Each structure stands twice: as structure tokens, then as C-alpha cells.
């Protein structure tokens, strides 16, 4: 139970429809800068080095 | 005069490559004020002294 | 009288939103976001410097935390900097982690009376 | 910036203009022939400035000017002045907006706006 929205409101119909995606830590916590674009010096200047939790999600 | 001399006998003579002249030079082109050898190069001064300050990032963006 | 309270530019796109920009955009907020985190550095550091608020390294998480905020508006990030962290907390929040100094300020007389 | 050949007269010919009938007709000097043209282009140039010729070590000027430096920022990981700025675009924007490199050595750091 929760309080309903105007833009689930019209859509009487489709309740069964709409679903809340969370995106979590394994241990359900916040996802920390480590995992999603570790620092990794290339050449002069460094950039973020995207892993494949960034792309997977 | 003796003292000027005594800062451009014992001056470092050893040249930049070709931005600055020299240190002798540099005091010979300052020492020589009515020589006006030519119009050929006049450089002038702009100050950035305004109400740019005010505002985030003025002077870059006002420079 | 306070400082500048205007923001940066707006980056405003060449082309028009097809929808991919925004995902690149949402997952570009669980890194580089630090908004609690610029509020936690600067309350433990005024209770730990004498002049408060107003020493050279108060006024730049000050400055810092409009722009923090302000991510959900305009697309620049806070850049949380080092050498500002303290590596130490005051016996309020008690995280484990940093060593725990006995806290002398106006909250810890107001933590020890209760 | 164009020469052609003249058949069985061996010169250079000369690109003139008919008065009446409104066509290219190219002449060559001895033979006094006529030919049409097949390309209606009499100059093709990649111009460039070309104002300093053999003068590059040996003069003052400069093709491509330095970046400027400022010290009234500080990087965020080195925590030091001395930084260049510029204008540039990243991946397309209305505008032109200002940049960051950090000039210290063993930094590596550049910061939009
Ligand atoms: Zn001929």
C-alpha cells in the first residue's frame, strides 16, 4: 500500500502494469563510485573506466 | 651612473633563446627612451578591471 | 551580504532528446554525486577549527554545496576535492571507521548533558 | 591555374569568350583553332596564408598561439593554481563553453567549467 499518483490515477486499468525498479547494492545498499567507473590512468590525462555493471545496467 | 654601470658590467650576458633578448639589452631599450628607431611594433596594456568580478568566472570570460 | 548565488550555463543540446541521454544521464548520478557527504565534511570541521564559517576551507564546501544540489537542474558535478576531509569524526554521528576525538564545541556540551 | 595542348600545333592555348553564342572556346595562339570545354573551370587553388616563407625559427611570428594560464582556480585532486583555459564544444552544444586543464605536472586533471 501506497499513496496513489495522478499519472497511475486515469490509468484504472493498467495498475497491474506499473512497477517500481530499484537499484541496489547486493548487500541492498547504495551503489558506491567504485564499482560504476573505476579511475585508471591512461596516457597523460585519466578517465573513468566504465566496467560491465555500467552496462549491464 | 657608476652604480648603473657596476648592474651592466658584471650583467648575466647569456641569452634566452629568442623571446627574451637579454639582460643587458632589456636595460639598454629601457635606458634609450627618445631613440625612436621606428612604428613599427607599438604593444599596449588592457586592463581587466571592471564588473566582471561580480559574476562566477569573469575575468576568463571576459579575457 | 552573501555571495553570488548565480549558477553556470545550461548545457543546452545541439539535437533533440532520443532517449538515451537520459539513461547515460540517471546512472551518471550514482557516481559523482556527493551531497550528504559535502554537508557531513563541513558540519565536523567547524567544531574542530576555531573561526566558524568563515575560515578558507569552510567557504569552499559552502560554495560547493550549491552546486550539489543543483544537479537535478543544471548537469555539472560537485567534484568533492582531497585534502579537505579532516580523517577523523566527532563523537555524534560515531562511525567506527575514523578515530573518535573528545569533541569540545557548543554540540558537544549539548551531546554530554544528555 | 589551367594549360592545355593544342593538336597537330604543339602550344598553350587561351581561354576567351564568345561574344553571340554564349560557349567556352579555347584558342591556341599559332593555329588559331577553336574546342569547346569540357570542364568550364579556368582556376583551381588550395589558397592558403603562405605570409611567412622560409621564416619560422628565424622571425617572431606564430602560426598556432599558446593557451593562456590563469591562477585563480584550484584543481580538485592536485589542490593547485596555475591551471590554462580555453573554449571548446563537447559532443555538440549550442555554444561555447570554458575549460579546464590542470598545467601541473604528475596531475592529469581537467574539469568542465
Ligand atoms: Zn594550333
Known amino acids: 500500500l501506497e499513496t496513489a499518483n495522478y499519472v497511475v490515477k486515469n490509468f484504472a486499468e493498467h495498475v497491474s502494469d506499473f512497477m517500481r525498479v530499484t537499484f541496489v547494492e547486493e548487500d541492498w545498499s547504495k551503489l558506491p563510485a567504485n564499482a560504476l567507473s573505476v579511475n585508471s590512468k591512461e596516457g597523460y590525462f585519466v578517465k573513468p573506466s566504465r566496467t560491465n555493471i555500467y552496462n549491464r545496467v | ?63 | 551580504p552573501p555571495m553570488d548565488y548565480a549558477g553556470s550555463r545550461p548545457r543546452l543540446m545541439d539535437h533533440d532528446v532520443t532517449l538515451e541521454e537520459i539513461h547515460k544521464f540517471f546512472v551518471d548520478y550514482m557516481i559523482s554525486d556527493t551531497l550528504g557527504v559535502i554537508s557531513t565534511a563541513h558540519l565536523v570541521h567547524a567544531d574542530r577549527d576555531p573561526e566558524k564559517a568563515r575560515s578558507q576551507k569552510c567557504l569552499e564546501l559552502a560554495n560547493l554545496h550549491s552546486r550539489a544540489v543543483d544537479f537535478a537542474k543544471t548537469g555539472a558535478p560537485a567534484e568533492m576535492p582531497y585534502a579537505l576531509k579532516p580523517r577523523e569524526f566527532p563523537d555524534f554521528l560515531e562511525r567506527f571507521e575514523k578515530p573518535t576525538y573528545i569533541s569540545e564545541s557548543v554540540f558537544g556540551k549539548l551531546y554530554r548533558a544528555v | 591555374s589551367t594549360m592545355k595542348f593544342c593538336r597537330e600545333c604543339n602550344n598553350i592555348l587561351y581561354p576567351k569568350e564568345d561574344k553571340e553564342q554564349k560557349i567556352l572556346l579555347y584558342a591556341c595562339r599559332n593555329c588559331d583553332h577553336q574546342e569547346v570545354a569540357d570542364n568550364s573551370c579556368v582556376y583551381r587553388n588550395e589558397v592558403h596564408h603562405s605570409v611567412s616563407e622560409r621564416t619560422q625559427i628565424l622571425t617572431d611570428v606564430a602560426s598556432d598561439p599558446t593557451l593562456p594560464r590563469t591562477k585563480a582556480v584550484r584543481c580538485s585532486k592536485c589542490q593547485h593554481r596555475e591551471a590554462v583555459f580555453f573554449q571548446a564544444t563537447a559532443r555538440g552544444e549550442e555554444g561555447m563553453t570554458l575549460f579546464f586543464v590542470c598545467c601541473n605536472p604528475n596531475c592529469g586533471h581537467r574539469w568542465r567549467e
Open chain 2, 1 to 63: 651612473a657608476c652604480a648603473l654601470s657596476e648592474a651592466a658590467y658584471s650583467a648575466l650576458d647569456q641569452p634566452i633563446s629568442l623571446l627574451e633578448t637579454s639582460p643587458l639589452l632589456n636595460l639598454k631599450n629601457v635606458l634609450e627612451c627618445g631613440s625612436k628607431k621606428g612604428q613599427r611594433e607599438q604593444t599596449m596594456s588592457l586592463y581587466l578591471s571592471e564588473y566582471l568580478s561580480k559574476k562566477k568566472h569573469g575575468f576568463e570570460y571576459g579575457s
